[PDB]
Amino acid sequence: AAQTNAPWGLARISSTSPGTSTYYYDESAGQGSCVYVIDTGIEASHPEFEGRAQMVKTYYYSSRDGNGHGTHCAGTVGSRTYGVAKKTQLFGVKVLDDNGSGQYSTIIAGMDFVASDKNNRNCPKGVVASLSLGGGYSSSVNSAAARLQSSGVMVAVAAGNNNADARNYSPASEPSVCTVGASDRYDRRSSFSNYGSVLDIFGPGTSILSTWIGGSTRSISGTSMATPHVAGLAAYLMTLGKTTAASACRYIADTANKGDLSNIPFGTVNLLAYNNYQA
Known about the structure:
alpha/beta; Rossmann fold; globular; EC 3.4.21.64
């Protein structure tokens, strides 16, 4: 299928050149896959989720997203106008509050919860998780992302927005997950994007239009916004049966658009998430 005047990031992961405005994808659109969005929550009521989004855990008063961050990345994963896997099931795991500031112990707990909660669900095609959160280095946050990964979830985390080597950041520095970087609509590395050897793939992270709280939309920029693109890509490529939860990070990397990106510091992968869709 095709999506005309799609948000530039969607169009980018379906072509080998920037500037284009059409998002091409296979009709499956990630049906039968689930993506746990681990963030500030999901306004499941948003018409762009079409009843495919639901909150399954919070670590605060409400399951309601009073921030917008989680609703945005849930939207980029699988909302209908702004999502990569537009048919996927989304599961809100609220580890950040409505300020976007979740303790390491809470983020560890939400990751251990997903690793268990996935057994309660019906995700025949595979389980994905999108961690648009971040933070300084910690073995315990790293270990939790790895446990979540080895438990059969495809974990995509953000490299962080500190214009630094991502190895000083968790869960970004965990080797066994998919540390996603951010690029912009001109195939540059994003101005804030972290980098380093641990980075596995780059995504559209600058000026990402997606859903927002209050039934609205909003365009915002961060490696936090490039993470759902790959997460939705993984959910999409898993529903296609082209990859599994444990190999989806390196399939997207094998099948990436290499050399396309500018200002990729030496020793960092120059790979852009690309669904390689044809007909």
